[PDB]
Amino acid sequence: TRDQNGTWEMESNENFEGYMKALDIDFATRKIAVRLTQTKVIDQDGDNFKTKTTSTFRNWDVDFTVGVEFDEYTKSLDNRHVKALVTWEGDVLVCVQKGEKENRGWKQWIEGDKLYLELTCGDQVCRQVFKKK
Amino acid sequence: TRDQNGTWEMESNENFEGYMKALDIDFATRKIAVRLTQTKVIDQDGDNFKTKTTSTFRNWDVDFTVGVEFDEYTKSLDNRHVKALVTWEGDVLVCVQKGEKENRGWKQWIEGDKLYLELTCGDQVCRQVFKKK
């Protein structure tokens, strides 16, 4: 068959390292890439192909009660120990991660179908916006 | 509303690189980590939160037509321009990617119920096998 439409989930990836090394890809990237399970979506119409590939990377859990300090270990980032405390500032969920970095925290709030998340550290601020799935 | 329950899919991420740099995450990691999208699942009961955040790598979509040589920029991988030309050899889709690297290309075919992708660069071959979802 020439019909390759579908969503395809990787079962094996033999010698991806050798191939990546032949393309001169740096060790930091190869070390992650070698382990990832890729999902490839092919939308094929005759001899036209539209593809995209995605791969899960990391999962992390954070659980807390508002107003109760908790220890957090930021493994999916910088892997530091912080003592985090979250409050409601109006309707915004506000967290301060107390530790070796000055001015570190995040704030999160809903406006209809959107969730806004602002993350800070020192003089830098990151803004992420999420849509309900 | 204080109700942030839900599954939330990232639609934008501004200045993640600055935030990471402020956290002292190394350049190599930021070049990678700045390529991730996130889904956040919030399970909230009053002031008690359980959140699970998952990161995903999403590559750039491609569109090609069998027979039509085109400029492919290999954003996911080694960030090179190659002149890719995909043809059918029987029921095997065969691609030669002309560029800096010799013998670089891939072959993709259905066998039984699985999709096989063989990627070559020089003397290195990577063999991926995917199952249909």
**Distance in angstroms (rounded) separating the CA atoms of residues B54 and A124:** 23
Q: Which residues pair with B7 in a beta bridge?
A: B41
By what technique were these coordinates determined?
X-ray
Compare all CA atoms of chain A with the CA of B23 and give the residue at the minimum distance: A78
- Indicate yes or no: CB of B49 within 8 angstroms of CB of A65: yes
Report yes or no: B94 at the A interface, CB cutoff 8 Å: no
- Chain discontinuities in chain B, listed by preceding residue (C to N exceeding 2.5 Å): none
A120, closest residue in chain B (CA to CA): B19
Q: How far is the C-alpha of A87 from the C-alpha of B48, rounded, in Å? A: 12
Structure tokens at A43: 């939308």
List C-alpha distances in Å: B94 to A50, B5, B104.
16, 47, 11
β-pairing, B70-73 with B62-65? unpaired
B12-33: b (≥16 Cβ within 10 Å) or e: ebeebbbbbbbbebeeeebebb
Strand, helix or coil at A43? strand
Q: One-letter amino acid identity for A77?
A: L
* CATH among 2.40.128.20, 3.40.50.620, 3.40.50.300, 3.40.50.2300 for B1-133: 2.40.128.20
| B89-108 residues labelled b (16+ CB within 10 A) or e (exposed) | eeeebbbbbebebeebbbbb
Provide the number of CB pairs (under 8 Å) joining chain A to chain B. Answer: 230
**B34 contact A CB<8A:** no
Q: SS3 of A91, please? A: coil
3-state DSSP call for residue A47? coil
- Last residue before each gap in chain A (C to N over 2.5 A): none
**Structural contact between residues B132 and B113, judged by C-beta atoms closer than 8 angstroms:** yes
Q: Residue B77's Cα: distance from chain center in Å?
A: 9
Q: What CA–CA distance (Å, rounded) separates A104 from A131?
A: 25
Chain-chain contact of A128 with B3 (C-beta, under 8 angstroms): no
Cα–Cα dist B41/B50, whole Å? 8
- Do the chains contact at A56 and B51, CB–CB below 8 Å? no
Q: Which amino acid type is present at position B88? A: W
CB B90 within 8 A of CB B78: no
Contact between residue B55 and residue A76 where contact means Cβ atoms under 8 Å apart: yes
In B, which residues are within 8 Å of A28 by CB distance?
A: 26, 28-29, 32
**Distant-in-sequence contacts of B62-70, Cβ < 8 A, 24+ apart:** B62/A49, B62/A50, B62/A51, B62/A52, B63/A48, B63/A49, B63/A50, B64/A48, B64/A49, B65/A47, B65/A48, B65/A49, B66/A47, B66/A48, B66/A49, B66/B93, B67/A47
**Does any CB of chain B come closer than 8 Å to the CB of residue A1?**
yes
Both tokens assigned to B7: 């599954």
Residue whose C-alpha is closest to residue A84's, from A109, A116, A108, A106: A106
Cβ of residue A107 closer than 8 Å to a chain B Cβ: no
Whole-angstrom distance, CA of residue B122 vs CA of residue A11: 24
Instruction: Please indicate whether, in this complex, the C-beta atoms of A53 and B32 are within 8 angstroms of each other.
Output: no
Resolution value (Å, 1 decimal): 1.7
Query: Residue A106, Cα to own-chain centre: how many angstroms?
Result: 16
DSSP A80: -
